[PDB]
């Protein structure tokens with residue numbers, strides 16, 4: 428195959444979707460074929476469609492979904508409220524394997540935080556990562572509390588020998604402050620910071636977002652993701 | 655000795671302090687002697703003082719602390735800004751074992767979440783709990799996202815063989831709402847919910863707070879602690 432990254436986060440609302448797009452944009456400008464996969468998607472009744480949002484920001488055309496639930500809740504709860512079921516574990520692993528191919532970077536965006544249940548019983552994006560041999564790229568905040576959440580997420584990753592591809596600060600304010608500045612310095616000592624996307628990056632149009640995305644990541648690190 | 659309990663939370667602002675006080679108040683009302691240790695306090699410039707809140711809310715007098723930093727940051731950040739080290743590992747551990755005594759419930763309140771740095775070098779409330787054989791009471795929210803943070807904290811607990819004494823929801827909204835109602839059912843499937851404190855409990859006067867606290871916890875569980 429190629430390279431699979433799960434793109435997880437320390438929680439909900441931390442910037443998982445916009446970072447997928449940014450890494451997707453950067454990887455294409457590095458000449459890499461990129462597929463983005465969103466196995467579990469909630470909040471459709473509110474118009475949430477993260478895959479569509481990646482295409483809008485990054486120009487990604489290779490989008491694969493699977494499960495879609497109306498309520499903006501945890502997948503288990505959105506499914507329970509719809510009278511529907513969670514996908515099966517192998518349904519997810521298969522969705523990913525069908526995208527996986529040599530030379531292609533396949534990003535798998537989760538729902539919420541790393542330990543959210545995606546399939547019954549208690550199957551998480553961590554389990555999905557073990558099954559498809561993926562590494563985890565962790566999206567974090569710069570806000571008070573992020574060091575603890577980040578450290579917890581990493582230890583959950585090392586518990587099942589799922590490699591950590593690094594952190595991305597989803598939203599980085601300009602100028603920062605003492606708490607943000609301190610958290611960034613501390614995040615850099617726990618793990619590699621691959622990017623810190625400027626606040627409002629989700630509101631950039633196609634060309635500006637691609638420029639921002641190329642500047643955000645180290646080109647050599649992006650290029651080094653796939654042989 | 656007696657019973658040492660650490661009271662931690664999934665993050666900052668989850669209601670660790672009000673939970674400490676409620677459990678203190680409940681246990682005192684069961685005729686138990688309570689001490690509360692808060693080794694490190696930050697945010698003192700704006701008047702943060704969680705031991706005082708526990709004294710006021712619960713009437714605890716054995717209130718033990720070692721360090722106070724002005725900045726409203728994480729202890730290591732507050733320390734760095736002030737130009738002075740954190741306390742040492744031994745200082746925190748020996749303070750707690752000196753508080754510990756037969757018949758007494760000794761609560762240990764951290765700063766922020768479980769993995770926050772509390773003492774020199776990089777020692778956490780989780781390390782402290784191991785060193786003193788304390789179980790952990792985990793304060794959680796009812797908001798979207800609480801399940802992940804909670805499972806993350808319980809797995810961090812288990813990874814170092816620290817018992818989980820249960821979860822407390824720091825702030826229960828009224829009326830609950832769909833997300834909070836669903837999270838409570840799930841949280842109770844992941845661990846024993848010991849109490850859910852009504853939102854705003856932190857502002858009650860002492861009479862009402864003790865009454866709140868007595869009814870918030872199961873009386874038999876509280877008693878069975880010491």
Ligand SMILES: O=C(O)C[C@@H]1CCC[C@H]1C(=O)c1ccccc1
Nearest residue numbers: 439440470499500501538539799
């Ligand atoms: O992807 C996100 O985090 C945004 C979703 C927006 C609505 C729900 C949120 C979600 O996927 C989720 C999953 C488990 C627990 C809490 C939230």
Ligand SMILES: O=C(O)C[C@@H]1CCC[C@H]1C(=O)c1ccccc1
Nearest residue numbers: 572666667726727728765766770
């Ligand atoms: O106990 C709290 O969470 C309130 C404190 C109010 C000021 C800081 C906060 C704190 O103790 C803390 C510790 C580590 C990381 C983030 C915040």
